[PDB]
Amino acid sequence: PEQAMRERSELARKGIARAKSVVALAYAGGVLFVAENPSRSLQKISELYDRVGFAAAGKFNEFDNLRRGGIQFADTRGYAYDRRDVTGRQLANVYAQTLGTIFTEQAKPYEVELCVAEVAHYGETKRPELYRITYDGSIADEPHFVVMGGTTEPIANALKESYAENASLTDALRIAVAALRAGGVASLEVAVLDANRPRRAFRRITGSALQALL
Amino acid sequence: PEQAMRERSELARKGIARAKSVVALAYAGGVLFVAENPSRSLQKISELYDRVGFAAAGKFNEFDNLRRGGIQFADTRGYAYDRRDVTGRQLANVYAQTLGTIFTEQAKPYEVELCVAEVAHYGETKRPELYRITYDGSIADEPHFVVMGGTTEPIANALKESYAENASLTDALRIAVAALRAGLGVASLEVAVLDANRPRRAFRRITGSALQALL
Amino acid sequence: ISPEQAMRERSELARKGIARAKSVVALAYAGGVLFVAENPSRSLQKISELYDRVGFAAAGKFNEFDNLRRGGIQFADTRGYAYDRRDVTGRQLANVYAQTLGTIFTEQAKPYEVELCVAEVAHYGETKRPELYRITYDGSIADEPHFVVMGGTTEPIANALKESYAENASLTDALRIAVAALRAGVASLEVAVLDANRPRRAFRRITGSALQALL
Amino acid sequence: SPEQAMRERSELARKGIARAKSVVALAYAGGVLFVAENPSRSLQKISELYDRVGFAAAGKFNEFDNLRRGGIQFADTRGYAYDRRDVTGRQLANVYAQTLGTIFTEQAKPYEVELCVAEVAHYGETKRPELYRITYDGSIADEPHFVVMGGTTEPIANALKESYAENASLTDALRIAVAALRAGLGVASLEVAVLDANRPRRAFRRITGSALQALL
Amino acid sequence: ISPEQAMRERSELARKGIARAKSVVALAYAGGVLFVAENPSRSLQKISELYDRVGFAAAGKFNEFDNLRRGGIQFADTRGYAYDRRDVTGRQLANVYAQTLGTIFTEQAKPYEVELCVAEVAHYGETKRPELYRITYDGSIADEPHFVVMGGTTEPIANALKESYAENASLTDALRIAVAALRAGLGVASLEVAVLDANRPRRAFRRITGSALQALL
Amino acid sequence: XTIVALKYPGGVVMAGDRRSTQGNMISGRDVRKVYITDDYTATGIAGTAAVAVEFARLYAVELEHYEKLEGVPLTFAGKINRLAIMVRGNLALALPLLAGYDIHASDPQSAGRIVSFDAAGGWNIEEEGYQAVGSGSLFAKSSMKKLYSQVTDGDSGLRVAVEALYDAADDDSATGGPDLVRGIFPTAVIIDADGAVDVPESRIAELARAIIESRS
Amino acid sequence: XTIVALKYPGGVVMAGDRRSTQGNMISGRDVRKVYITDDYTATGIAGTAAVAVEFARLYAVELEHYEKLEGVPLTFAGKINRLAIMVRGNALPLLAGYDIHASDPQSAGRIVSFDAAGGWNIEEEGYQAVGSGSLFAKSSMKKLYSQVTDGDSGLRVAVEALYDAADDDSATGGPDLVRGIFPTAVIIDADGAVDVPESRIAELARAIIESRS
Amino acid sequence: XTIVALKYPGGVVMAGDRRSTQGNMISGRDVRKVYITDDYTATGIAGTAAVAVEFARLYAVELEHYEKLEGVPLTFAGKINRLAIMVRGNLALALPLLAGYDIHASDPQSAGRIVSFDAAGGWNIEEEGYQAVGSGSLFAKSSMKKLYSQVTDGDSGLRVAVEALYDAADDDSATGGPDLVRGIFPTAVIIDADGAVDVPESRIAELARAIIESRS
Amino acid sequence: XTIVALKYPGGVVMAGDRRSTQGNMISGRDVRKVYITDDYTATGIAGTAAVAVEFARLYAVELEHYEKLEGVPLTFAGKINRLAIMVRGNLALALPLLAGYDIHASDPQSAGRIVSFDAAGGWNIEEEGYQAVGSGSLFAKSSMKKLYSQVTDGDSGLRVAVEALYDAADDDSATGGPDLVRGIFPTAVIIDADGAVDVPESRIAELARAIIESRS
């Protein structure tokens, strides 16, 4: 039972290492998601609920299945209780439960690494929360940034030196695009969890509007 | 086990390499499907929904099962939501989900390579979308052409050179048949188009007398 | 565990079981399709009716192909009742046998030691070339235009037929060519035709006295 | 290995049948004759299946009695759902082949049995008796003259190939069968029965005790 | 798994468990069938009534044969109620035990470390030779005409009985022959004795304990 | 419709009329309501041709099913038990009359048995010597009560059964009398130590003609 | 609506009217109620066109299903048993057949009817009728049955029975001389079941009409 | 509400009214009740706008589902069978009227088909040449009976269908006549060898005006 | 209680009364019955505060659920289809009225859509230009019939909607009129190309006060 645990962990770690990178960082107006994605159709970043966002790295069919299941869970909870019941902590806990079960019960573990981020509700003061959920169901509370997929170490170090709390949109975007290289609009997918939006915080920054911010 | 992943991947890749070839390419009027098929009964190309087409290479019993399951899914979605809900992206995602589950849970993976193509709705301006779904559940968005089955490289190179972004039907057909021979007439070919100029059902088969005219 | 060694050993177990059983041949003739099998038994049938214009022939382990014959008749009758008698085609039954054998080869302990042939003739008063399908132990389906040979030693019978075949051969001629080629008497033969000249049920057995004068 | 499993299962079953006592079934002028080496007065190896259909088996008792019961259940259900003429020897033999074949492939241990299903003609009809041999793996063979199951088959099979008569009488065919059996016995160690084609409906009849004496 | 290695190892596991347990003998006598077992316990029974004229005796692991004894009584009572009391025979119960043990040997993890004996006597006022059946761990059933020996070391007890047997032993006689042949491989304090008395109107099973057993030996 | 049954010294006889009605309309004239179910039993149902035959068929299959499985037939008590289970199963209609002969009874002269069923599906063994079921049952029973002293054997017993049915028809329009124009007479079964046999049409016709001549 | 069936020496004939009603309104004039179910049997239902055809179709599929699975057709008793199971599972049918295995080929014709409770009945009177005009048709056949000596006189009597049913029951349709619509019929003998040509029924119907005027 | 359908040499025409009622109150004036279901068929339901469109949509999906799965469309008999299974499933309410063209029929002139359903969900192929369903069906059928001789082609067929609907409206308040004030006229579908087509509104308007002008 | 909805050039408006009754007793005066369900739709139910809000909430969740999963919102036809499935599911009651703007329609001026449901749960697209549901619907519809020609834009439309509700209240005691004493007025939603917006209470107060002064 120890050899199986190592080989499964290796199979997954290698699949994540072969996929493109995604970074999630906290800024003045919320959370920013930047991913290396040449595709215009296949999304790596998405809305989960009102103030909750999703970002993933790894095998597409596997994380899209998790994105769908998370939206399913979030909408069911918000309807059965209240919209405020759906938190980042709740969704992260659910993904940890799901990935942990897959790792232990399916033939091949999911070659994915997920990030669930939450911003404050409109007119409230709360520091953004970022969660990293890995292939085995491990959950880590990151206070500043999350780096998933590809080669983690060169991007993580390039971000550790250039980190500013409460950085601006145009500033934090440039710092993120910079750390991703060390490890253009046609090779990127960008989105924010804007804490200044009344209800739905998730907003995509595409095309013409994205060229300006660099 | 990493050994299991490689042996399954090899078993599937060899089965696809032993089967005949299929190519689909975007053209001015839509997508064109051309397959090497001597059979008059066993289809490798098919209609999935209104503006969505299917093409596959590999073991017949396996891809026909996927063709049927895709039509099943498409019809259920269009009825439960709207006809515009069924897109190429949606069907391609479903095939990726299905093949990925087969590769992992089932004893023998599927010896198939699929292509899902979508054209624009009547009177709309949209660039044709082509998706390649492989045995393991990997999905790739190809902008110009997809080549599946047999020997991929000689046909892929031969197409990388003689392709036209807005080729006519007669031109694009001749360019496709050329790349398939180097790696064949009405008696050994299955040809079909996703004609973006049709009101609703874009899929149309070009057989017999009409195809001999186009050759 | 190992997906490649298991695939070869299962394939060998089945191929050897088919090689040890008696031979069956199916070929196109002017008036329909002809089935000739080496069978000493007067009770255990290797050739049978599936539906109106569809016939069945098999080689291998009896209990296994009789189970498939029954399941095929069950499927055909259900379809014809739920849709139209015309829904039932050779292509349809062949596809179903391919699906079934492929699932057995994958999910069950031992694969089926059988090789099947599904043949279809035209409807009364209609012009259509007879269709013959070979379905193997693994679920592979092949569209044969002229003849199908199953069981025992395939190559000597296949070569002896590849040389003596005639497209529009009459009954007496095609029967004699078939009995010959197996070798490559009435007390050891089971013969039947899918007569395209009968109003509805094309299947007809040629036994005893009638087979004697014809041989 | 799957080919290794097929051989080991086949060996386990063949050895179990080889260790059990022998049973012969042969066609005679009046029907079919079943003769078995059985010291027991309670545990039956030969039985009636349906009106013109008989059963005989060799091997492990608990296993073939289970098959005898299942065959009677099948036969009665079919005859009730269709007609009494639907039940044939070919039908029951086919069902036993299906059952044994499924046991051999899916269950952890194959059945150590060899079965014989025999059928005679209906009253007032002309039809040659049919005898079927169903083996542990589901193989079915149509034997025209005789069936030998259990123990050492060749010495009994050869002794019968040389002593077989086409339309032998009851007293004659019985004596030929008991002889064939000795090459691998009296009232106390024999279980004898016939499928008498001259009976109106139920052809199966047991020949026991005092009546079996006058035939020996 | 190899189907032949598994079959031998299971058969060995069971045979060794039966060989380590105490012995039981069942023999015919003029008045019916007699069961003799080596049992120091006053609570845990190895011999029991199944139905009217049918008796049970077992050797091996207790929890396993008591489970079979209960299941046999449950089968017998259901059959006699659904059909008639005469439907329940020794042949029927033996067949059912053979079916059960055979399924356990095949489907369950560990085979049952037991050897059973089902005996049947004639109904009141009828002439019929007593029937004795031996059912083994694998589901094998054997029709024994004179005696059955189960558990411990079979051969020394079987040989000592093969010599000393008589066609119609009296109860005092057959009992002494059984206790004697059991001493080849013990008195009131270590014996369980019971008879299937064919002279009883309906329930043939009768236990011979204490004071009544002393005078008989 | 009426079915009668009576015990005679040495056996039992059961007879039934031939009519069936759809209200006031006569729907049948050849209706057979009494059938032999095994070597020693016969059932009669005062209902339609289909209910009578289907019931008898299912019961006969059950009796023979047990015989094939266990080697011996059920005891008489077991036959009734199985019949009762079948009757209670159909009521969750017409009530069956059973005539039989207990081959295992001590006194052969009184070994004949008659079993009837009440509305609740409860069985009843008749000790009066006779019984009847159906729309003309009370007329048939009151007739047998005056004529029973005349039963001394199988022939006088059959005569009394036919006369009971005649009286049932004379007072109840739903029960059919002997049709002299069409040559249709009541069916009957007689069971003794030699088994159950159908009474020939010619024998019932002669007795019926004698009853009609006697009443004129 | 009415269906009639009668035995003639060496065969059986079954005929049905062409009307369907919705209370007092005539909803159909070309209703086919008699269908050949296998080589030797035919069923007739005195109901709507749909009930008649759907029933016959399911029964025909059941008979042929057995034949393909077992190699031989069901015995006549087995065909009735299957029909009875179908009727009890579900509009009472009339079955007409010829038992090719019967000892006497002359008397081999069979007629089977069903009562309200779904119980089968083999008719030994020589004829039978089902539907709203069945009593009129049976009383007519009672007086004309002595005239049945072969297949043709059998068909004349069957057509006359239906005519009498229509003459006294408004739910049964008589021969429409204006539209040219006549009762349908099936005749079964040793050579199998065959549909009677419309021309022969029209000839018999015109003769019955001229004989009554 | 009323739907009419009639065969003309070369095809078939189906037309429906535009009204809906809730008792006595008019709830709809634009209700479309006739829809093309495949290249050669059309369905019409005399019911609400919802029941008509939902039924046609589900049926159209099933016909196209089969075509995509099997490569060829169902035969006409198969289309009816599937419709009948759908109708019997909803009943276990308004009855469907189907018009089609059998592309595989021998005589193209008479290849037009009309199928109606009775209260019990039973199908009926109309051989009379025309049919109508709904509250004004009797008036429309009665009208077509006198005007059918005039139907010699598709144009005459459409003219008569509109006149039958007009007569239904003139005698049944639940059926809506042509509204000349709002410009709302009956909808129609014509089906021939070239397929099923919606008849242009201006064409129906012209025919309606001519009928009104003729009766003035 | 009443809900009204009307199409104006370039859009649609929906308004509802504020009352709720329990027989004859007024149980509510502040009841909101019209709710925005997505950027381009609004639902109104003529029932209790709870039925109105719970229905709107579930439907709003369903529309947004699809948008999040698929990336794009449902087409207008898809939104109705989902609503219809929800309405038919609750019947196995007061029925909804949907007002929406089809952003993908070719002509933006007539892109306003109104959808209602009948007793059987059937959808219906109104083509008349207006619709009303509830106990005062006839009165509101008959009022809009006479005033619809005055609708040229959003403000004209809103006036006609408030006047229709006033006329419903004037003739139906279950519909609440404008309460000048408490300052409670009908709620309204207007939907155009820029989306769905709640009409300010002060605009409705202004319209209602004026309809009152006008009739004074």
Side-chain angles (χ1 to χ4, degrees), chain E residues 117-156:
Chain E
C117 179
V118 173
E120 183 188 14
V121 297
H123 285 267
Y124 189 64
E126 283 181 27
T127 312
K128 182 174 162 292
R129 173 108 77 125
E131 286 164 15
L132 288 88
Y133 301 88
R134 174 192 271 120
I135 303 88
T136 56
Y137 57 89
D138 64 331
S140 288
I141 176 175
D143 197 343
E144 297 295 301
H146 301 127
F147 54 87
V148 183
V149 183
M150 304 162 290
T153 333
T154 307
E155 284 72 51

Side-chain angles (χ1 to χ4, degrees), chain B residues 76-83 85, chain H residues 57, chain I residues 65-66 74-75 77-79 81-82 85:
Chain B
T76 297
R77 286 293 295 200
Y79 183 70
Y81 296 93
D82 46 54
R83 297 194 76 81
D85 168 69
Chain H
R57 184 173 162 247
Chain I
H65 185 246
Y66 179 90
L74 280 158
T75 62
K79 288 180 194 170
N81 190 38
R82 288 275 99 192
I85 288 160

Side-chain angles (χ1 to χ4, degrees), chain B residues 108-179:
Chain B
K108 191 193 78 58
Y110 271 21
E111 300 164 64
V112 300
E113 210 177 306
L114 317 177
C115 179
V116 172
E118 185 189 12
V119 296
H121 285 264
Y122 189 64
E124 282 180 28
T125 313
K126 182 175 162 293
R127 174 107 77 125
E129 285 165 15
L130 289 88
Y131 301 89
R132 173 193 271 122
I133 304 87
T134 56
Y135 57 88
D136 64 329
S138 290
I139 175 175
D141 198 343
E142 297 296 301
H144 301 127
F145 55 87
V146 185
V147 182
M148 303 162 293
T151 333
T152 308
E153 149 212 304
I155 305 173
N157 291 329
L159 212 46
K160 242 164 177 288
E161 290 179 77
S162 57
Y163 181 73
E165 305 282 274
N166 284 49
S168 77
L169 184 56
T170 51
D171 279 283
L173 193 264
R174 185 182 48 73
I175 292 166
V177 180

Side-chain angles (χ1 to χ4, degrees), chain A residues 8-208:
Chain A
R8 276 176 170 271
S9 193
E10 219 62 65
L11 204 166
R13 196 202 54 77
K14 282 188 287 177
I16 300 164
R18 268 150 45 217
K20 285 156 284 182
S21 303
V22 192
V23 287
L25 49 88
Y27 85 110
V31 174
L32 169 81
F33 294 110
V34 183
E36 195 185 321
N37 188 48
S39 182
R40 201 160 57 206
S41 304
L42 311 177
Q43 322 274 48
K44 303 192 83 182
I45 301 154
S46 180
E47 183 177 0
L48 276 185
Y49 212 72
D50 292 352
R51 321 305 285 182
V52 187
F54 179 88
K59 206 167 153 59
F60 185 80
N61 66 116
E62 293 183 335
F63 65 74
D64 191 68
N65 189 65
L66 294 175
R67 183 187 71 88
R68 288 182 175 266
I71 286 163
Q72 188 74 58
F73 181 81
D75 284 355
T76 294
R77 287 291 296 199
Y79 184 70
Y81 295 92
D82 45 53
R83 296 194 78 81
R84 192 169 292 255
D85 168 71
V86 193
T87 62
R89 192 196 83 240
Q90 200 175 259
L91 280 151
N93 205 330
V94 175
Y95 280 135
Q97 203 79 251
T98 315
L99 284 171
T101 299
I102 292 167
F103 190 78
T104 302
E105 259 68 58
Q106 291 203 221
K108 192 186 72 54
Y110 270 22
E111 300 165 63
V112 300
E113 210 176 305
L114 317 177
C115 179
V116 172
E118 184 190 13
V119 296
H121 286 266
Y122 189 64
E124 284 180 28
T125 312
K126 183 175 161 293
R127 173 107 77 126
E129 286 164 15
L130 289 88
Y131 302 88
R132 173 192 271 121
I133 302 90
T134 55
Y135 57 89
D136 65 329
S138 290
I139 175 175
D141 197 343
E142 297 296 301
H144 301 127
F145 55 86
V146 185
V147 183
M148 304 160 291
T151 332
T152 308
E153 274 207 3
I155 305 171
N157 291 329
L159 210 45
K160 242 164 177 289
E161 213 87 274
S162 56
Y163 193 69
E165 199 187 27
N166 333 236
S168 77
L169 184 58
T170 48
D171 270 279
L173 193 265
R174 185 183 46 74
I175 291 167
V177 180
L180 230 47
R181 187 170 301 272
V185 188
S187 73
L188 286 182
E189 194 168 289
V190 173
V192 286
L193 275 179
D194 185 21
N196 209 259
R197 296 236 67 153
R199 195 174 57 84
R200 297 173 73 179
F202 195 84
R203 199 183 66 211
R204 286 183 187 283
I205 307 166
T206 53
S208 185

Side-chain angles (χ1 to χ4, degrees), chain D residues 42-44 61-62 65 68-69, chain E residues 50-51 54 71-100 118-120 128 131 133 135 141, chain F residues 65-67 69-72 74:
Chain D
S42 304
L43 311 175
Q44 322 274 48
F61 185 81
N62 65 117
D65 190 70
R68 184 190 70 87
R69 292 184 170 262
Chain E
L50 275 184
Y51 211 69
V54 185
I73 287 160
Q74 188 62 59
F75 178 82
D77 284 357
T78 295
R79 288 290 298 198
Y81 182 69
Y83 297 89
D84 46 51
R85 295 194 79 80
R86 192 169 291 256
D87 169 70
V88 191
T89 61
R91 192 197 82 240
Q92 200 175 259
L93 280 153
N95 205 330
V96 176
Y97 279 135
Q99 203 79 253
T100 315
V118 173
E120 183 188 14
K128 182 174 162 292
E131 286 164 15
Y133 301 88
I135 303 88
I141 176 175
Chain F
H65 187 247
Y66 180 92
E67 195 184 326
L69 285 182
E70 312 305 315
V72 289
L74 278 155

Side-chain angles (χ1 to χ4, degrees), chain F residues 10-12 40-41 76 79 99-103 108-109 111-113 191-193:
Chain F
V12 70
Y40 290 98
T41 58
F76 199 70
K79 286 181 192 175
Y101 186 91
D102 196 4
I103 198 68
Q109 290 293 108
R113 301 282 178 265
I191 321 175
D192 60 16

